Design a protein around this ligand. Structure first.
Ligand SMILES: CC(=O)N[C@@H]1[C@@H](O)[C@H](O[C@@H]2O[C@H](CO)[C@H](O)[C@H](O)[C@H]2O)[C@@H](CO[C@@H]2O[C@H](CO)[C@@H](O[C@@H]3O[C@H](CO)[C@H](O)[C@H](O)[C@H]3O)[C@H](O)[C@H]2O)O[C@H]1O
Lengths: 208, 218
């Protein structure tokens, strides 16, 4: 019923600004405060401020004076947050929220690195025993995220997806799958690495 | 500003047990209007925070009665009576009585299980990669508990510390273990100047490491 629907992920150069949106449906937009909240590392939350959409009046956290501007468009039931003069400290997930319901979040990456597809390397043994662990190493891409699908989804129980880390300004992650040895190499195992930001998919068949 | 401090940082529980977490504020959350705007939120992995309790104890619509909030002034508690799998995630307290609004730093509710040693796998750099002039050696440390673990890389017996990227999974939803990937990055030239590469996993399940190695001359 009540829904807050936010705009998509953003990759912005340091020094620029970005304006993200929060569309309200299922209630009277002008009756509820809209709050904005910054989350880093999927953990620490910091409140930015809130606006009354009936009037447009804003109250900010002093920590965001000059960094954030909150506005509304009453005719479209949308709240907006503009962040100015961006730095890498502004990379985070940003949520809009009313008192009882949050949007799904907008991920902001502030960087001058260009969108780059991953290199994908197979991890295969060149066993003994009844199981075998395989993997794919996904290196040198930007920005987040990638998805690694094993045997287009038929494997997922015994899959481990390791979160990406930065190296040389680009992301690297890995993914493992453990499968009965009676199924590999006698049957195909493939990792399919999708990087939607670069409109690239890479499929590797794992070979002994 | 008002500081909310949460304890513990992580809380492993058996399913069906009672869990209790603390939120303490630096100033009273009692508002001059006589109400106390102390709220609890749950954030599951990959989801937004969701409201559980507001006004210290009032359950938001649809929130099961095993969630009970209590406290007053500067001291608050959330008690979950019979933890279920859908309850796992990070719990935040939040106060709505002051500007700025502030949150606690989160308590991660997780599953306690029996200790388990890692299953360790080592991979030399793929032939494909070496053409790129880079060489990544990978070590998966899979399905262990608890989450704390060490990995030491050695090159011909000599400990190696830079060039290492260590990444942990979140708790597994099937068996409640953790896994971690460790990657040693070298140039192709560095990689080809040495003979053996070793991953040593040290975990509380043994006073000796689990050692996986390969010799590049094989
Ligand atoms: C423009 C707008 O959005 N106005 C209000 C919001 O300010 C309000 O948010 C709450 O505001 C307080 C400060 O007043 C604090 O900042 C809180 O963090 C924030 O949630 C929002 C929600 O109001 C709450 O509504 C509940 C109704 O479900 C109230 O609970 C009910 O209150 C009566 C006793 O008065 C009974 O005690 C009920 O059993 C209890 O459910 C709660 O007291 C309100 O804070 O509402 C917007 O209109």
């Amino acid at each position: 019923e009540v829904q807050l629907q936010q705009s998509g992920p953003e990759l912005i150069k340091p020094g620029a600004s970005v304006k993200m949106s929060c569309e309200a449906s299922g209630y009277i937009f002008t009756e509820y405060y809209i709050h904005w909240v910054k989350q880093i590392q999927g953990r620490s939350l910091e409140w930015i401020g809130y606006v009354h959409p009936k009037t447009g009046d804003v109250i900010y956290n002093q920590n965001f004076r000059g960094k954030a501007t909150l506005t509304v468009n009453r005719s479209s039931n949308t709240a907006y947050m503009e962040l100015h003069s961006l730095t890498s400290e502004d990379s985070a997930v940003y949520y809009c929220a009313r008192w009882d319901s949050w949007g799904q979040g907008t991920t902001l990456t502030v960087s001058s690195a260009k969108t780059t597809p991953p290199s994908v390397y197979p991890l295969a043994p060149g066993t003994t025993g009844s199981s075998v662990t395989l993997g794919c190493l996904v290196k040198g891409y930007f920005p987040e995220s990638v998805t690694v699908t094993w045997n287009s989804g038929s494997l997922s129980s015994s899959v481990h997806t390791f979160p990406a880390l930065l190296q040389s300004g680009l992301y690297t992650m890995s993914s493992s799958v453990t499968v009965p040895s009676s199924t590999w190499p006698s049957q195909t195992v493939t990792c399919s690495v999708a990087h939607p930001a670069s409109s690239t998919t890479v499929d590797k068949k794992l070979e002994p | 500003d008002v500081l909310l401090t949460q304890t513990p940082l992580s809380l492993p529980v058996n399913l069906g047990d009672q869990a209790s977490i603390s939120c303490r504020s630096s100033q009273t959350i009692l508002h001059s209007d006589g109400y106390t705007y102390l709220e609890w939120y749950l954030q599951r992995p990959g989801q937004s925070p969701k409201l559980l309790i507001y006004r210290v104890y009032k359950r938001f619509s649809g929130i099961p009665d095993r969630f009970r909030g209590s406290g007053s002034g500067m001291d608050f508690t959330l008690t979950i009576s019979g933890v279920e799998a859908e309850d796992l995630g990070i719990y935040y307290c939040f106060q709505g009585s002051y500007v700025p609004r502030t949150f606690g730093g989160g308590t991660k509710l997780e599953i306690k299980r029996a200790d388990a040693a890692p299953t360790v796998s080592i991979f030399p750099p793929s032939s494909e990669q070496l053409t790129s002039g880079g060489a990544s050696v990978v070590c998966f440390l899979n399905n262990f508990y608890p989450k704390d673990i060490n990995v030491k890389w050695k090159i011909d017996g000599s400990e190696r510390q830079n060039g290492v990227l260590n990444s942990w999974t979140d708790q597994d939803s099937k068996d409640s273990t953790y896994s971690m990937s460790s990657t040693l990055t070298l140039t192709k030239d560095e990689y080809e100047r040495h003979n053996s590469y070793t991953c040593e996993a040290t975990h509380k399940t043994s006073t000796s490491p689990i050692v996986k190695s390969f010799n590049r001359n094989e």
